[PDB]
Amino acid sequence: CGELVWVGEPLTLRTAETITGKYGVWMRDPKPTYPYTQETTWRIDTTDVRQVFEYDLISQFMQGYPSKVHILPRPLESTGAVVYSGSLYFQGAESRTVIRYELNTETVKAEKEIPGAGYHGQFPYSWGGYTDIDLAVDEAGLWVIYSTDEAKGAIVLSKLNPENLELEQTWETNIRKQSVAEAFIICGTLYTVSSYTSADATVNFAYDTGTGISKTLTIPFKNRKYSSMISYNPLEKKLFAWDNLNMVTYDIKLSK
């Protein structure tokens, strides 16, 4: 682990064929858990988002033929969901509740109202929408990024116990959530993306959970169609940026 020092140029990943009509944001598990593997893919059905497609083999994923279709027990608020350690973690629609849905048993194993978190457009990033609550995974596990009335719109982040969703540790930054386009976590440091609509953007803030200090940064971050979501995969050590149909990757290097 270490501080982020380099971000590569965006590299396009080959998009799966859209013939079967399933082209929502997809994700993999950075802690693959039997019966799944590092190659298992999940795709959120992009309405009242209620379906998640599961593809055991990349061959099936690229053909658009899921190995399993999960009907979620509640609707999703956002695409800021993550798969980690065998569970889908997502925000219930029109709520501040995070839900742990164990994928192979199709069982809700935990629910947690994030205390005081704004939802449904109260604390978005810089470009509106319902991005108030943002789940993230890094080398240490599961996190949630949000804000509260108490924090006055500043980014708040909490480390989540992946079994029962307890908030094991919480930090209040001094970074206004609305002042940045999105945030992600690498090795316990929160980073923010300055903008998705400026071609020559930056990673422009870093908040270190080991020190409680936020700093400005100017690491070049190139936007080459606008990305609508970004997610760090700590198993692959890359950022995955989604544009509503295609996925691009950004290689990263740390001060390891």
Author numbering: 245 to 290, 293 to 470, 472 to 503
The authors write:
Olfactomedins (OLFs), modular proteins containing an OLF domain that are predominantly expressed in neural tissues, are involved in fundamental processes of cell growth, cell signaling and cell adhesion. High-resolution crystal structures of the ∼30 kDa five-bladed β-propeller OLF domain are available for four subfamily members: olfactomedin-1, latrophilin, myocilin and gliomedin. While the folds are nearly indistinguishable [Fig. 1(a)], one difference is the presence or absence of a heptacoordinate calcium ion bound in the central internal solvent-filled cavity of the β-propeller [Fig. 1(b)]. To survey the OLF triads for calcium binding and to test whether calcium binding can be reverted by simultaneously altering Asn428 to an acidic Asp or Glu, we replaced the triad Asp–Asn–Asp with Asp–Glu–Ser, Asp–Asp–His and Asp–Glu–Lys via site-directed mutagenesis of Asn428 and Asp478.
